[PDB]
């Protein structure tokens, strides 16, 4: 079997184990986690499997080991603006993206797959999401972990979006495909979108973009309030978050 997509990230086994040990050292609330158990549960999800035949059930053992409650009122979701979202939680250190949780941290920027009836990780090729399989070891992992993360969110949930995208809100992102449809009005009062002016100077109100009106319509039918804010100056936004009641701001 040869796929269209790049193979498993080189040194995947080392990276997953080292990330697990580092995260559980930095976060003493997760010190109970056995990182050997985490590796065996992760590997066990997909090794010896046809990589388009991975289910959410295949990840249940890893999900159970990685069980974690972050403050439900301090969640940042993002779509197509990951690096700025991560920089935000690096400066506003009480807030969490999915990749600030143990399971999100383990898998961030990695690709992985195996092959039917072999014991080995495939470093040669993995199914491409677009060309081979929408349901692959990576997409199934992110669907299962991100649903659980979105489900747990409460009060005011923030989502960071990229105002320089053709579609500022799109339904193929993890956010647009799974997270937005798992915010529960039992827990969530408001979704507040931050539309980042991340490219050329652009003075326009991008909260009037048709895709933002689509997002507003989706979360209105979930009985959740919608708020939208332009971030015209993202670098100044990060600075002002670190040091508020200072400078220009």
């Amino acid at each position, epitope marked *: 079997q040869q796929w269209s997509g790049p193979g498993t990230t080189k040194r995947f086994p080392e990276t997953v184990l080292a990330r697990c040990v580092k995260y559980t050292e930095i976060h003493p609330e997760m010190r109970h986690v056995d990182c050997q158990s985490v590796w065996d549960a992760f590997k066990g999800a997909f090794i010896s499997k046809h990589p388009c035949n991975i289910t959410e059930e295949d990840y249940q053992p890893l999900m159970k080991l990685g069980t974690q409650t972050v403050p439900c009122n301090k969640i940042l979701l993002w779509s197509r603006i990951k690096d700025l979202a991560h920089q935000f939680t690096q400066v506003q250190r009480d807030m969490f993206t999915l990749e600030d949780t143990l399971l999100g941290y383990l898998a961030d920027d990695l690709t992985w797959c195996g092959e039917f009836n072999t014991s080995k990780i495939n470093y040669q090729s993995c199914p491409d999401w677009r060309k081979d399989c929408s349901n692959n070891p990576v997409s199934v992992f992110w669907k299962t972990v991100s649903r659980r993360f979105a489900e747990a969110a409460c009060d005011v949930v923030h989502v960071m979006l990229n105002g320089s995208r053709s579609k500022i809100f799109d339904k193929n992102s993890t956010f647009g495909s799974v997270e937005v*449809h798992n915010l*529960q*009005p*039992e*827990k*969530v009062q408001t979704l507040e979108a931050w539309v980042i002016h991340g490219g050329r100077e652009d003075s326009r109100d991008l909260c009037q973009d048709p895709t933002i009106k689509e997002l507003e319509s989706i979360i209105s*039918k*979930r*009985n*959740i309030q919608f708020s939208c804010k332009n971030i015209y100056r993202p670098d100044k936004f990060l600075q002002c978050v670190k040091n508020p009641e200072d400078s220009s701001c």
Partner: antibody
Amino acid sequence: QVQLVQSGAEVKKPGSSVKVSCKASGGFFSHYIINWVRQAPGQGLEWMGRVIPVIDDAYYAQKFQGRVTITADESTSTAYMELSSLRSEDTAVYYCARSRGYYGSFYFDIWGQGTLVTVSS
Amino acid sequence: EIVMTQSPATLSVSPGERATLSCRASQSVSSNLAWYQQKPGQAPRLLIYGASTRATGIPARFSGSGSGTEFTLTISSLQSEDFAVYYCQQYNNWPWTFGQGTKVEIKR
């Protein structure tokens, strides 16, 4: 809804499935939710799950996730609760109950008359 | 989940007299507390929401009080139609939880 009208009493063998209907007089009002609550004979009330009718979006108590399906059909103004792999301990009166559907108002203002489900060998 | 505990299990009250029912939450539920009346063969009926706000058409003799972990339903003069089971319910923390109820029976 102004009234919730449930289907009649059910008698089931263990391991079987039951589907209880809840017809909304006046239809599903915008931003109201249909909840399902059960009561074992001589015991208290237990919230099971709900549906947002306009998007047929269900949300379940962990106790019932994987065994209950709650749905709503806007076309017929009818909500359903299907409980599968029935156990003797599922013997209860099942109520559909309206709430406001938004954060901070999840109390139950309009209740169906209840449906008795008896599960026994 | 938040555990709701009601006391007493049974309250014997003379017609025309006052009933005081207690509801305790395992942790604070602010004022997001509802009260229901249930008679045999009937669905629960909403009496109070927001700890102290009477639902539409509920008589003035029913009053609710309390905040945080400790709540009271007072029926100031018991009519024959008020003899029933009473349940509290928190809507501060999902999943929604109910007390196991107080039966108000007729003293004679």
